[PDB]
């Protein structure tokens, strides 16, 4: 393992000498620059070399015909054009009850529930992820929205706050239910 997430090739480019710009001699102009190739520094900081994960960002998946997947923040949103909401919420419940995840709290009235830790089994990665999720059903466009929010994410004990995973494993949960439906 560990290979699938890193860029191919050496990291030698990282070592490259710092661009020092030469100071002007007395009474002589240097065409400082004309063309492109100028470089803006932002200091990041993001991962560099192998450390950077290059796995394809998970996309929220809409199995149902005419279903909208939108993702923002820690929330995966699946919109589906149906009649009533109060009946789909427990279909979701049947799916998750088939998957046997642990339910810390629940609420049929608010149609929302809070799960315990969820342990994933991905081959592409070495240290498995834990997810705490709140899952809820809220109709917004007279068609309902199944929403998944990754409350707490944990990579082998240490709580993680990197961006990609938040998506990839919010979306994991999303694709789990979507598939289930």
């Amino acid at each position: 393992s560990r290979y699938k997430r890193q860029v191919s090739g050496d990291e030698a480019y990282l070592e490259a000498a710092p661009l020092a710009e030469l100071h002007a001699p007395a009474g002589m102009i240097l065409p400082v620059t004309s063309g492109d190739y100028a470089i803006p520094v932002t200091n990041g900081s993001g991962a560099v070399g192998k450390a950077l994960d290059i796995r394809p960002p998970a996309q929220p998946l809409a199995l149902v015909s005419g279903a909208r997947t939108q993702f923002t923040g820690d929330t995966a949103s699946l919109l589906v054009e149906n009649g009533r909401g109060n009946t789909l919420w427990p279909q979701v419940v049947s799916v998750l009850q088939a998957k046997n995840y642990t339910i810390t709290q629940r609420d049929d009235a608010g149609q929302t529930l809070t799960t315990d830790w969820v342990q994933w089994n991905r081959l592409d990665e070495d240290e498995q992820y834990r997810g705490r999720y709140q899952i809820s059903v809220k109709p917004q466009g007279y068609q309902q929205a199944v929403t998944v929010k990754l409350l707490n994410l944990e990579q082998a004990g240490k709580p993680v706050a990197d961006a990609a995973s938040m998506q990839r494993y919010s979306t994991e949960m999303m694709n789990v239910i979507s598939a289930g439906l």
């Binding site: 009474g27 002589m28 102009i29 240097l30 065409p31």
Partner: protein
């Protein structure tokens, strides 16, 4: 040693027909664009005519044209044959 050719071609008559008070567009029109300029501070058009056929040595005329700020008043400095 193959024939080395360098710079832009010049003739007596074309090098004679530039005088003080000409704009940059006419001299450029009458001699072509300068292959080398001065990128340091001033602006002077260097018209070097260097050619060196094998085992014969060099003949070179250097036409250095120094402008005003606004591309008029072409001072004409001619160094005909090198030493």
């Amino acid at each position: 040693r193959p024939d080395i050719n360098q710079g832009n071609y010049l003739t007596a008559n074309d090098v004679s027909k530039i005088r003080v008070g000409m704009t940059q567009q006419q001299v450029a029109y009458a001699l072509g664009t300068p292959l080398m300029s001065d990128p340091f501070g001033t602006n002077t058009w260097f018209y070097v005519f260097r050619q060196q056929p094998g085992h014969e040595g060099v003949t070179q005329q250097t036409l250095t044209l120094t402008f005003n700020s606004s591309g008029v008043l072409t001072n004409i400095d001619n160094k005909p044959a090198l030493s």
